[PDB]
């Protein structure tokens, strides 16, 4: 129950439960498959 009118006044947000490290761990242009050779 929100007792207040504005959105800033609500409690903390709830877990992204998004999670996708590939923008950080695999930003390569041509896709690399694990097990296939790195450099062909």
């Amino acid at each position: 129950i929100n007792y207040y009118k504005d959105a800033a006044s609500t409690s903390s947000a709830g877990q992204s439960l998004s999670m996708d490290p590939s923008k950080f761990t695999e930003p390569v242009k041509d896709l690399m498959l694990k097990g296939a050779p790195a450099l062909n």
């Binding site: 929100n2 007792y3 207040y4 009118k5 504005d6 800033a8 006044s9 609500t10 409690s11 903390s12 992204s16 998004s18 999670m19 996708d20 490290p21 923008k23 950080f24 761990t25 050779p37 790195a38 450099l39």
Partner: protein
């Protein structure tokens, strides 16, 4: 008027509680969000990116050189480097992994340790990396080392080798601040055959080493880092 009773704890301020508050700026409209590449949602997303370990810690002032593990041509049977696995201290401590682990009290999971070779292309080498699970001493010679988790690495076209320290543990969580009961083992590396340089070439070659966490990893019970402190408030 509805009858109430107040409980113990009334009026306390707990920095970790999460409740509603009146907005000081009623009706204000925040700036629209635009798109920005790079959004982070979990610290677990970022500790999977690998970063360099200053393994060569033996210097006396911080230098680019403590990131370089040297290799000697023609040595046989001998040991390249050694370290315990207290990820919250020692070599690990300044790495991104080490640096985040320090915001939490407990960790569990597998670690990924990789070595990228930088010697001339016409050289060759075979190294053994060994993980020694808790309970034995840091290995003292390859024979001792080779009886635990190990990978023979053959230096080739493919420049890096990724060793995993699989989670070996009785207790399902360990402390990030070094603790005995909770200790994780040792990591050592030895010549399997030996580094060989081509003609017209000389000196030391170096390995770069990285650390990142496997998708396996768990961190819990947040706390304050020993890695930052201060004596007076800063000003502009």
């Amino acid at each position: 008027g509805l009858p109430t009773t107040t409980l113990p704890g009334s009026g306390q301020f707990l920095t970790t509680d999460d409740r509603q508050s009146p907005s000081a700026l009623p009706n204000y409209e925040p700036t629209p969000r635009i798109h920005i590449p790079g959004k982070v949602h979990n610290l677990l997303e970022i500790i999977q990116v690998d970063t360099l370990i200053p393994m060569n810690n033996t210097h006396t002032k911080d230098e680019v050189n403590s990131y370089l593990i040297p290799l000697n041509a023609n040595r046989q049977n001998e040991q390249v480097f050694g370290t315990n696995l207290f990820i919250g201290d020692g070599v690990f401590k300044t790495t991104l992994l080490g640096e985040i682990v320090q915001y939490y009290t407990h960790w569990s999971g597998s670690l990924r340790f990789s070595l990228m070779y930088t010697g001339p292309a016409l050289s060759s080498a075979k190294l053994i990396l060994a993980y020694t699970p808790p309970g034995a001493r840091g290995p003292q010679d390859r024979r001792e080392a080779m009886l635990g988790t190990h990978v023979v690495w053959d230096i080739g076209l493919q420049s890096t080798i990724v060793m995993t320290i699989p989670w070996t543990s009785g207790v399902q969580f360990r402390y990030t601040d070094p603790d005995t009961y909770t200790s994780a083992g040792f990591l050592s590396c030895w010549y399997q055959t030996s580094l060989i340089l081509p003609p017209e070439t000389t000196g030391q070659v170096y390995l770069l080493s990285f650390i990142s966490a496997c998708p396996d990893f768990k961190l819990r019970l947040m706390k304050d880092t020993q890695t930052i402190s201060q004596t007076v408030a800063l000003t502009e």
